[PDB]
Paper text:
RNA exosomes are key players in degradation, processing, and quality control of a wide variety of RNA molecules and have a structurally conserved 9-subunit core common to eukarya and archaea. The common exosome core is composed of a hexameric ring of RNase PH subunits (Rrp41 and Rrp42 in archaea) capped on one side by three protein subunits containing RNA binding domains (Rrp4 and Csl4 in archaea). This architecture results in a barrel-like complex with a continuous central channel implicated in RNA binding in both archaea and eukarya. Whereas the archaeal exosome has an active phosphorolytic RNase PH core, eukaryotic exosomes rely on the additional hydrolytic RNAses Rrp44 and Rrp6 for activity.
To trap a complex of the archaeal exosome with Pi and RNA substrates bound at the active site, nonameric 3∗(Rrp41/Rrp42/Rrp4) complex from S. solfataricus with the D182A point mutation in the Rrp41 protein (Rrp41D182A) was used. This point mutation was previously shown to completely abolish RNase activity but is not directly involved in RNA or phosphate binding and presumably allows for both substrates to bind without being turned over. Rrp4/Rrp41D182A/Rrp42 mutant exosome crystallized in the cubic space group P213 with one copy of each subunit in the asymmetric unit and the full 9-subunit complex is generated by a crystallographic 3-fold axis. The density observed for the Pi in the 1.8 Å structure presented here is clearly tetrahedral (proving that Pi and not Cl− is bound) and facilitates accurate refinement of the four oxygen atom positions of the phosphate as well as determination of binding geometry. The small error of only 0.1 Å in coordinal positions for this structure (as estimated by the refinement program REFMAC) allows for accurate determination of the hydrogen bonding distances. This analysis reveals that the Pi ion is bound by four residues from the Rrp41 subunit. Specifically, the phosphate is coordinated by the side chains of R99, R139, and S138 as well as the main chain amino groups of G137, S138, and R139 (numbering according to the S. solfataricus sequence). A total of eight contacts with binding distances of 2.6–3.2 Å are observed creating a strong phosphate anion binding site. The two phosphate binding sites are almost identical and reveal very similar interactions between the protein and the phosphate. The position of the Pi-binding site is highly conserved between archaeal exosomes and RNase PH and PNPase enzymes indicating a conserved mechanism of phosphate-dependent RNA degradation among phosphorolytic exosome-like complexes.
Residue numbers in the entry:
A (entry chain A), D (entry chain A), F (entry chain A): -1 to 5, 7, 9 to 176, 180 to 275
B (entry chain B), E (entry chain B), G (entry chain B): 8 to 241
C (entry chain I), H (entry chain I): 6 to 114, 117 to 169, 171 to 181, 184 to 196, 200 to 217
């Protein structure tokens, strides 16, 4: 048994004013526009024993995603599909108040939001992960480790996840069925990338890619996932506060505009 | 996908038009020990909620010095689903407990009771889609039944898309086989959204069409909520 | 540009619009002001006294402490320097040993109040920062020997009293005291005043 | 690892006297006789997705039991029997001090006492739950949820359990083996009902079906299970206090007399 | 059921008459750290118990202001049973820990030590039926060995029914295949029953016959308990 | 998730001096030499339902080890070996501050050190525990229960473990595969015994087989495992304090000299 | 055993001589929130460490009145190993967390901060043998980066035996198939050993040969540690 | 038989030998004496002032409390009789209600300091046995209304001050106070003194 409790980065009264002092001019503390992401770095193949991996740095947020593939029986009700299992860990390395333990509700939410966006996007078509229909399929274990919690971890987890998937080597399968790790025969087949765009409501402003301070003062945030044709493939409101109908409408319009740019950047990093 | 979800007459698998809600039944004050309680049925989806508090939260280092802590549980009984659900909390239940709690946090006047906990326990007795919203509304009503001040009631409904058609208040068939499922809950008198999620996929124009339809359903549900609370006095 | 939206004695529910305009109402937990609009926060009865309005809560099993209120508490712990007392609030009350004794605790000294005793006390200190402190200084305050103690919803206490009209009707049945925290100090046949109490709480 | 600790509904000194003030006349607060159950309501098929269910209201105690059947392999040492698994949950809904968590010792005890009474009564003959001997059998998952804790939860759990079992639909099994939930072919086969009768010792009195207040002041309670031929099919003393040999003798005599009436009421509710 | 439990000579599978106890061996003061300790063997069933306290229970919100809290563990070693028992507590062990604790609560003079805990740990080293009683008696003896005031010792025995015959002090064969198993424990000098359970089935006349036989066995066991406690002094 | 925390038998200043007052003369409180073990008793077949067992008393330390064998499939990567699983429990019986729970880090360490010494010694050759190559093998469950914590529990766990293994009956296996417990066909085949020798550093002295008081004042301890040819088959430093290179060199020389004697004593107890 | 570990040219499976270390890379200050942080790579073994504190440890009955408590986690990521490692702590991780903590306890000047906790979290990103030492050294460096006083840095290396040859700084092949693996860590300037373990088997003369070789490798590693800490200033 | 091993202003690391011989140095957390040898315990700068030496720490985000130090705290809780204050130390600080008010707490009395306020205070009591007690008695001590508060590594505070040379260079840019606990009280353009601060912390 278990339950969700109200949790607080106690922020000084003075500091809040300073954080929003330039929003009127369309810019934040760090000089960036309300619609700008922080500087993004994606390092592929960072975790050398992962089947694929990506280290994502998004401002001071750092996430390492890694995959490992295994041969399994398909679940009996989906004999013609492989499997995707997403786990996110908010490491105690990442932030002072994060003590160790199994995934808490925040890590579980992040995993599930990411999983839905990957699965519902149809970026990873699990029917492609069949080896022998009804007998052997690939299971894709995606493990996503937040190493440095610098704000907007969800967007970074999405980027890391997609990059790690695109980086995933597929090894030769030998019949007698064994995996031969001396022979890479392919890469995991993705249809396209996906991005998740989080918009935080801060008083009368909407801000893309909130940092730690901005997340400390926001009313709420809403995250929108997109594929390149700009279909919406996931939404999640989070936080204690509410938003108006109009706030959400505006947030989506703003998230979509940013998604176009973020997708193009991500593709450059992936080599597609 | 497999079963047809919009039939040739333009109606859904259970007889409803695209813009028609399932039938709603609300009962209040159903439990003797709970400070407040409610059963909420929306078609074959049914939840019971029990509220306790505010009471001093013992730790006490997990209390907040300026407001109450909400403690909230969303749980499904093993016999609420087509096939037995294991009673251990699933990742889904963990997520849904947080999402429901955060929806209640915008409504409950927690600053009235510093250092306390308000416990909100919901159980899904029958699951046929929309159970996160039915639990949330049963909770909102149980909090009202308990006399715990709130800025507004919360009403919610899932909209979605089935065989290309935007639809209101999905059943499990539509949730399982349709293209999109978007639960929305609001404080309707305050124009504020408390819960908002989408799974599946929609174009941005479909999203706006669905959001608009949800608001219509929410306003119907809200009036039923208000009338249910008043009925024992009226 | 002022108006009350609802007839007096209207049944009211959370989020229900009561009034629009600028009124000068004392803040109340039962009414939320958002700019120039006022909303009920509870299931209740909207009541207008003169140019001012209020919401009378119909639900709630908790008592909110008020300094100088008279309560009936139930002793729940004996500590080194006093007693923890349940006064049916969101906060436990405390009665200092020194208040009851009129002096400081002696060396080597549950003789006066132990777990399970009822005690009639006035709330001496309380604010948003602290749990209520109790006093048993007044007359007829202290440990309850005889009689019974009937519980009601605290929101009902003004209705059980009624220019003390209801206080009088009950006692025509039998001697009762109606505490602020929804507890009522009160032959075995006439002990069925609790049949009446339960009627005040379900027919108000 | 785990251990059992002394736990207290702190009841006022004054209230106890009032609770027993009428026992001398053979009646309690609520007007009922020392040997009377509280008003009982049993609503069958309450949980519409359960294979069978019953909502039992026994005074202010409320219990919802539900069953779900699944096809499984028999345990290797009982190839010619199906299975019965009983779980009881004392929901945090039920009582103020019940926090959430897995079953505590009270919920586990209740489950095990109920299970023994069902199994030892031979009311449910598990040899009847075989589909293919040594290959496929029914597993009966019985889940019993205490929604409102108003005293004597054990007796209510027994009634709910038996009623839910009698209410349990059995579906067509198709060979190719699959369950076809569009076709109800039977009801779970029970030999008879069982009841559990709890007698609380309160000073010099024995009281049937104690309520919350009476359970708060009792020395101990002893529960006796009966089938219609009034064989004793389970006994469990519970509580911190002891009872005399003579108290137990008397309690059984009193429990048995009440069982006759409770069985007849239960049968009326079940339609047998 | 399968094996014959009462043979043609009227004796049981291990040679005993229906009213004959297994052999009993008691050792006290077996552990150096424990405040008190005991090993109790009843035929092939053997338990060790260790007692610590009374000592201040740290929480301290789980203490009682007028008496000690008993903390009690019944646990079986993995090698105590015919087939390995997994060392994680089973539902059975959870139930039996409570039943044993509640039996000890009637005996231990807990009101002497407000705000403390008295810890009672038992381990079943060999299980051949009646292990809940052997653990309970080893505990009672360990508490005596620790000098913790009690109103009386506790002695207990299981009676039952095998092939229709009422029998005293079951072995595992009888427990597994017989018709009834009824563990009873008492404070014999006080005429008070501390533990009482039945599984299986008995007519009410059989129940009374068995209960009567149990009392006889209990009085034999009690005198052995008293003599064992005195032996190091006598 | 989980982590290791600094834990303290708060020992009086006065008592420490007394404990070491005779080390200069080569003796401790109890009259024993710095290189002497405490009095050792090993009682075989103590736990009569164990396949083998041993109760070891080493001063006031008492450990009961027991085995149970089961037939299992070999792990797929070792088809030609049986299995050994070692579990150690520091029972709450054993010491005042030991509360119940699953194995803590101390019990897990002890299990793993013991397991390595058994496995790495090659005392138990798991290839001998095959019944049908690639289909059925013995699993040896070794469960080691510390009943009385009197110091140097590791050495006692090793002795108990080895003695229990040597005491382990092997039963007839019948083909149809079932174990027939009415027929003992052998004993578990061991190549030789193993011992673990723990040396505690106490100021400028090294002490073999520290007791509870000596463990309370030591800087650190180092344990060395030996077979009869005096190969080193395991080492483990434990404790908060460090030791010099020279301390360890000396400790090993001293441990080895004691091992010769301890092995001979152990063999006498085992009847080999 | 199966693969040859010492080839005909006298070199190891990765090209190294018996007395040659793998390549080492150290990075400090890699995490923004951590009070100190480090990445340590030794060949294909790579760990990251984060340090927080000293800070008041809340309980507070788990604090020590004369010194800080170290809280230490050794954990391997699921993708750090050839086949996926389940993320739940294994018995191995539990042991290694204690061994690493106890190694840090000799070094950290804990008596400076009574009643506090110093939290040390390590994650193995790539495991190719020696990960307990690489985690330990990354920790030592992260503590330095955090400004937490220590008597010395800790440097460590595993020595062992492969095909009869004593070897320095094992890779996973050697760890898996060799005869002995002996991790050693020291405070080198103080001549003190902080961690010392052996698995497998060695004669006592082999043990001394290996121990001597380890000290040589440790002194090389230590100078790299010192130079890495100084580099941002030098 | 005395010698310093290293040149002055040497970069030093934990365990690094600084000196051999008998010196009479006040104990310092940054230097460990083992018989006649002295070692750095931190990453730092070895400095020799006269016949005495010290290590200047270059790392560390914590402030070690010192009696009579002036700190900028952040209020984290309001208790019955005072406030818990974060002063960026391993220990939370406490400000008694009686110190701020000049009298004891009145019946029924966050008006002066609530969660989130900065407060400038002197450390009144501290030792190895207790958390720091704060006072707001001095002038310009108390709640900070206007301005900002910039955080730095506390080990940097002497460098931000510099015969107060650096204090003067900054204020030539703008008014600043440099607290002992690595916090600095200080138009929106000139608010970019924090560009300079971050330079003192990464170029010292
Ligand atoms: Na949750
Ligand atoms: Na239990
Ligand atoms: Na550990």
């Amino acid at each position: 048994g278990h339950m969700s409790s109200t949790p607080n980065n106690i922020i000084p009264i003075i500091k809040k004013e300073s954080i929003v002092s330039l929003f009127e001019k369309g810019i934040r503390q760090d000089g960036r526009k309300l619609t700008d992401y922080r500087p993004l770095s994606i390092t592929l193949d960072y975790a050398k024993k992962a089947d694929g991996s990506a280290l994502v740095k998004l401002g001071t947020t750092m996430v390492l995603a890694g995959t490992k593939l295994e041969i399994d029986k398909p679940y009996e009700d989906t004999p013609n599909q492989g499997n995707l299992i997403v786990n996110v860990e908010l490491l105690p390395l990442a932030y002072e108040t994060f003590e160790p333990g199994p995934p808490d509700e925040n890590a579980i939410e992040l995993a599930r939001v990411v999983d839905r966006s990957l699965r519902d996007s149809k970026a990873l078509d699990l029917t492609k992960l069949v080896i022998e229909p009804g007998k052997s399929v690939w299971t894709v274990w995606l493990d996503v480790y937040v190493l440095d919690y610098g704000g907007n971890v969800l967007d970074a987890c999405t980027l890391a996840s997609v990059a790690a998937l695109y980086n995933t080597k597929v090894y030769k399968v030998e019949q007698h069925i064994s995996v031969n790790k001396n022979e890479v025969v392919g890469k995991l087949p993705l249809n396209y990338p996906v991005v998740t765009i989080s918009v935080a409501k801060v008083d009368k402003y909407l801000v893309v890619d909130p940092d730690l301070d901005e997340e400390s003062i926001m009313d709420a945030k809403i995250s929108f996932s997109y594929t390149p044709d700009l279909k919406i493939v996931g939404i999640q409101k989070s936080g204690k506060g509410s938003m108006s109908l109009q706030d959400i409408d505006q947030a989506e319009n703003t998230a979509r505009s940013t998604a176009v740019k973020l997708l193009e950047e991500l593709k450059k990093h992936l080599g597609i | 996908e497999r079963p047809k979800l919009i039939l040739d007459d333009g109606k859904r698998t259970d007889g409803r038009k695209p813009d028609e809600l399932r039938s709603i039944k609300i009962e209040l004050g159903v439990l003797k020990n709970a400070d407040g309680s409610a059963i909420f049925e929306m078609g074959n989806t049914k939840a019971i909620a029990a509220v306790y508090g505010p009471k001093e939260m013992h730790p006490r280092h997990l209390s907040l010095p300026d407001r109450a802590v909400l403690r909230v549980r969303y749980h499904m009984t093993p016999f609420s689903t087509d096939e037995r659900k294991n009673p251990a909390p699933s990742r889904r239940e963990i997520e849904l407990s947080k999402v429901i709690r955060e929806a209640l946090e915008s409504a409950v006047l927690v600053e009235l009771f510093p250092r306390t906990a308000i416990d909100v326990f919901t159980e899904i007795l029958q699951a046929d889609a929309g159970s996160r919203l039915v639990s949330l509304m049963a909770a909102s009503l149980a909090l009202a039944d308990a006399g715990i001040p709130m800025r507004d009631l919360i009403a919610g409904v899932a909209v979605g898309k089935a065989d290309g058609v935007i639809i209101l208040d999905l059943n499990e068939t539509e949730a399982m086989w349709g293209e999109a499922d978007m639960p929305i809950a609001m404080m309707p008198s305050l124009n504020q959204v408390t819960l908002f999620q989408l799974n599946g996929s929609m174009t941005p124009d479909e999203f706006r069409q669905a959001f608009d339809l949800a608001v219509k359903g929410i306003n119907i549900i809200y009036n039923l909520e208000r009338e249910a609370l008043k009925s024992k006095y009226v | 540009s002022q108006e009350i939206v609802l007839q007096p004695r209207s049944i009211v529910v959370p989020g229900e619009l009561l009034a629009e305009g600028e009124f000068q109402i004392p803040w109340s937990p039962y009414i939320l002001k958002i700019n120039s609009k006022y909303y009920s926060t509870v299931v209740g009865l909207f009541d207008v006294k003169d140019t001012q309005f209020e919401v009378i809560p119909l639900e709630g099993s908790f008592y909110y402490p008020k300094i100088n209120d008279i309560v009936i508490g139930l002793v729940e712990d004996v500590e080194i320097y006093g007693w923890v007392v349940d006064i049916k609030a969101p906060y436990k009350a405390y009665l200092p040993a020194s208040n009851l004794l009129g002096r400081s605790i002696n060396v080597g000294e549950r003789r006066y109040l132990d777990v399970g005793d009822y005690v009639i006390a006035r709330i001496e200190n309380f604010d948003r920062s602290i749990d209520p402190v109790l006093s048993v200084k007044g007359k007829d305050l202290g440990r309850v020997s005889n009689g019974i103690v009937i519980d009601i919803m605290p929101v009902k206490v003004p209705r059980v009293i009624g220019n003390k009209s209801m206080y009088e009707t009950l006692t025509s049945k039998c001697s009762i005291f109606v505490a602020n925290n929804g507890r009522i100090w009160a032959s075995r046949f006439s002990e069925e005043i609790l049949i009446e109490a339960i009627r005040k709480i379900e027919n108000e």
